[PDB]
Amino acid sequence: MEVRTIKVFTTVDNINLHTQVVDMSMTYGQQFGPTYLDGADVTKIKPHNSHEGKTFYVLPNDDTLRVEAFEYYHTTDPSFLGRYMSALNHTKKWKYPQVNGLTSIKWADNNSYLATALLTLQQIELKFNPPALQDAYYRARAGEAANFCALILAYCNKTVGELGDVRETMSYLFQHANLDSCKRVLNVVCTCGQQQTTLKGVEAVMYMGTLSYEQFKKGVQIPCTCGKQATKYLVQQESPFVMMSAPPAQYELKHGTFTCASEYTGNYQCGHYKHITSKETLYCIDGALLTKSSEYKGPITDVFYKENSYTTTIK
C-alpha cells in the first residue's frame, strides 16, 4: 500500500539505455507494454528487488525507440523484437563448442541448419550492414553466438525448434550483407536465338539446380527443351564466394576444390544437416561432433566455393 518504486532502463538495442521509474504494484505489462529480461517475458512479472539498475528490452512504442530499432536492426517488422527475445531465451542455453577452430552449435531444438549456416558464415568473406549483425557476428566468432543465433531466427522468421532450410536462411543473411560489388553474367545455348541475363547482388552468388561450379562454367542442360533442350553457362563472375544449391542428391566432395558444403538426410518433414569443410583433409562437423576422411560421398544440398574473378572463354 505504500508507494515503492525501482529504477530500471529500457532499450531496443541493448546499447542506448533509457531511465524509467517503475512501480512494484504494477506489472512490467502495465508500464512498458511487452517487456523482456534476457529473453524472458516480464510482461507480467512485477518489478523485483533484484531488477534495479538492469536493462529491459521493450517494443518500439514511441518514436525514438522506432529510430533506434531501425538503425540497429534494419527492419520495421512489428514483431521482430519479441521474435528476438523468445528465441534469445532458448539460444542462451545452447552451447557453442570450438570445433576445429570454428564456433558450431551443439544439437538442440533442430538447430542443425543454424550450426551449418554459422560454420559457413565463418569460412566465407562477407560484411553485414545491420550494426546488430556486426556486433552479434563479432561475438559469435568469439564463441558467444547466442545473440547471433536468436537474430537469424528473428530475421528469417523461424522460431526455436521450427523446420529449417540452409539455402533460405542464407538468402535472408545475404539480404542484410553488403554484396553490391557482386556480379554474375549468364547465357543460353542451343537453335532458337540466344538470350542473356546478368544477375547482381544476392542473385549473383546464388544458383539453384547444380552443386558443381565447374559444371556451371562448362554448362548445364536445363528445362528449356524450347527445341533441343538448352544449356546454361556462366560468362562472368565478380564475387568473393559463390553458393551452388540443389535438391538433396548423392555427391562426392573432393578435398581442396571447394571450401565448405551442406549435407542433408531425411525428408521435407524432418531431417538433419551436417557441414563439411575442406582443410588439410575433409572435416565433417555435426553440432558438437567432428569426424574426418580423405574423401566424402553423401547427400549434398549446397556447396560453397572461393571466388574473386572468373571470365569465361567457353565460346
Ligand X SMILES: C[C@H](CCC(=O)O)[C@H]1CC[C@H]2[C@@H]3CC[C@@H]4C[C@H](O)CC[C@]4(C)[C@H]3CC[C@]12C
Which of ligand X, Na ion, none interacts with 225 (beta carbon under 5 to 8 A by kind)? none
Interaction of residue 176 with ligand X, rule CB under 6 A:
yes
Residues contacting residue 294 through CB under 8 Å, at least 6 positions apart: 255, 281, 282
Interaction of residue 308 with ligand X, rule CB under 6 A:
yes
Which of ligand X, Na ion, none interacts with 281 (beta carbon under 5 to 8 A by kind)? none
Interaction of residue 200 with ligand X, rule CB under 6 A:
no
The nearest distance, CB 125 to ligand X, in angstroms, is 13
**Cell (9 digits) for 214:** 565447374
DSSP letter assigned to residue 204: G
Out of 3, 21, 53, 180, the only residue in the binding site for ligand X (CB under 6 A) is 180
* Residue number, 1 or 270, with CB nearest to ligand X: 270
Closest C-alpha to 150, from 105, 95, 88, 108: 88
Q: Which of residues 49-78 bind ligand X (CB under 6 A)?
A: 74
Residue 147, classed as helix, strand or coil, is helix
Interaction of residue 305 with ligand X, rule CB under 6 A:
yes
Rounded Cα gap, residues 295 and 175, in angstroms: 34
The nearest distance, CB 306 to ligand X, in angstroms, is 5
* Residue number, 165 or 307, with CB nearest to ligand X: 307
Residue 259: count other Cβ atoms within 10 Å of its Cβ: 19
Rounded Cα gap, residues 204 and 186, in angstroms: 10
Write phi, then psi, for 169 (nearest 5 degrees). -25, -60
CB 118 within 8 A of CB 148: yes
End-to-end alpha carbon distance in the chain: 86
Interaction of residue 134 with ligand X, rule CB under 6 A:
no
Closest C-alpha to 170, from 238, 231, 130, 120: 120
* Residue number, 35 or 239, with CB nearest to ligand X: 239
Rounded Cα gap, residues 282 and 273, in angstroms: 16
Rounded Cα gap, residues 35 and 159, in angstroms: 19
The nearest distance, CB 314 to ligand X, in angstroms, is 12
Binding span for Na ion by CB under 5 A among 147-155, 201-209, 244-252, 301-309: 301-309
The nearest distance, CB 28 to ligand X, in angstroms, is 30
Out of 62, 308, 311, 314, the only residue in the binding site for Na ion (CB under 5 A) is 308
Binding span for Na ion by CB under 5 A among 26-34, 109-117, 211-219, 299-307: 299-307
The nearest distance, CB 239 to ligand X, in angstroms, is 10
Interaction of residue 313 with ligand X, rule CB under 6 A:
no
* Residue number, 72 or 94, with CB nearest to ligand X: 72
CA atoms within 13 A on the CB side of 195: 4
Which residues lie across from 233 on neighbouring strands?
Answer: 187
Binding interface with ligand X (CB under 6 A): 74, 129-130, 176-180, 213-214, 257, 267, 269-270, 305-310
